[PDB]
């Protein structure tokens, strides 16, 4: 005794375990700029330019009518670029105070106009300042947690992704974490495994927002819908759960 699985499957499981730790979202203080402004010799009129289309026009290859694979790859890459740009979370935004209310700083709004102020006149400068003073922050609740709610500017295709991500975060805060933990407890009871819950039991647990990239009660049907996949499932089961003995 003092003196196993085939290596390629071991490499496969190692690669899957590595891929499980990839990070998709980001945590930022301010959103990226969606609208910028071009100044002319004038003092009353400027050009509002949407940066989304300007950045979007430089992604992918040219379309040609006799390489279908390149066309499909270009579409895939463009969609992935949209998905990657649209996913972020806000945390610790800048704030100012005014007459007992909270006001968002101009840098957290999704517009850039720092280069149009020097050309303005007095009346327009006063008007802009008074308008900026009217962005009141509202206190809201997300699963009994205090959050800030304000109004900013963003392009539509990336705003849809952001809104969906926020909905998913709210959903996993409400019920998904409890379902995952309960299913893990039942599985450990069945297979004689003790699962730790130390991460949820510190003294700062009443002011934490939990994010999960995966859910535990996995639907088995999607595994068995792959065409002619019995032998692969058998090999995976052997490589994952077979013990060793004498």
């Amino acid at each position: 005794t003092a003196t196993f699985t085939v290596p390629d499957v071991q490499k496969i499981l190692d690669d899957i375990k590595a891929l499980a730790a990839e990070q998709v979202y980001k945590i930022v203080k301010v959103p990226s700029i969606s609208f910028r402004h071009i100044v002319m010799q004038s003092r009353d009129r400027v050009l509002r330019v949407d940066t989304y289309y300007e950045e979007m026009s430089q992604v992918g290859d040219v379309i040609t009518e006799d390489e279908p694979e390149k066309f499909y790859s270009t579409i895939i890459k463009k969609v992935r670029f949209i998905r990657g740009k649209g996913s972020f979370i806000l945390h610790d935004i800048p704030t100012r105070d005014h007459r007992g209310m909270e006001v968002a700083e101009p840098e957290v709004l999704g517009v850039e106009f720092k280069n149009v102020l020097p050309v303005l006149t007095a009346e327009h400068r006063a008007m802009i300042q008074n308008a900026l003073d009217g962005s009141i922050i509202e206190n809201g609740n997300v699963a009994t947690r205090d959050v800030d709610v304000f109004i900013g500017a963003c392009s539509e295709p990336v705003y849809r992704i952001y809104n969906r991500l926020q909905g998913y975060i709210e959903a996993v805060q409400l019920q998904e974490l409890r379902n995952s933990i309960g299913w893990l407890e039942r599985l450990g009871h069945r297979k004689r495994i003790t699962y730790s819950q130390e991460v949820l039991t510190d003294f700062r647990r009443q002011d934490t927002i939990w994010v999960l990239a995966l859910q535990l009660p996995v639907n088995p049907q999607v595994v068995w819908d792959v065409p002619r996949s019995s032998i692969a499932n058998l090999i995976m089961n052997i490589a994952t759960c077979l013990p060793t003995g004498e």
């Binding site: 069945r190 297979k191 004689r192 996995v218 499932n233 994952t240 759960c241 013990p243």
Partner: protein, 100 residues
């Protein structure tokens, strides 16, 4: 021969597989002590084989199998435990195909 080697019980962690393998009618719920487990446990096929061997004049072989019975029981208990408590996963075969 006459046993119930598969059974259905409370819902499993994976809903596509609910069966319980029960080789030789051994229940897998309880832990076993290999030193003394199968002292007084039999099942149908083993008794029929012992009776036939005695009726055929093979006394030594019948006594050998009667002495080796606890080894058989503990081995099949270990196999049942491994099947039911270790090989449970999404990669396990669904019931509607296992029956077919």
């Amino acid at each position: 021969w006459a046993t119930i080697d598969v059974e259905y019980r409370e819902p499993a962690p994976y809903v596509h597989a609910q069966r319980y393998i029960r080789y030789c009618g051994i229940d897998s719920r309880e832990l076993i002590n290999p030193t003394t487990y199968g002292i007084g446990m039999t099942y149908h096929c083993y008794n029929e084989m012992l009776r036939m061997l005695v009726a055929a004049g093979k006394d030594s072989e019948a006594a050998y199998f009667r002495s080796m019975l606890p080894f058989h029981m503990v081995r099949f208990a270990r196999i049942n435990q491994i099947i039911n408590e270790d090989l449970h996963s999404v990669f396990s075969l669904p019931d509607d195909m296992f029956n077919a």
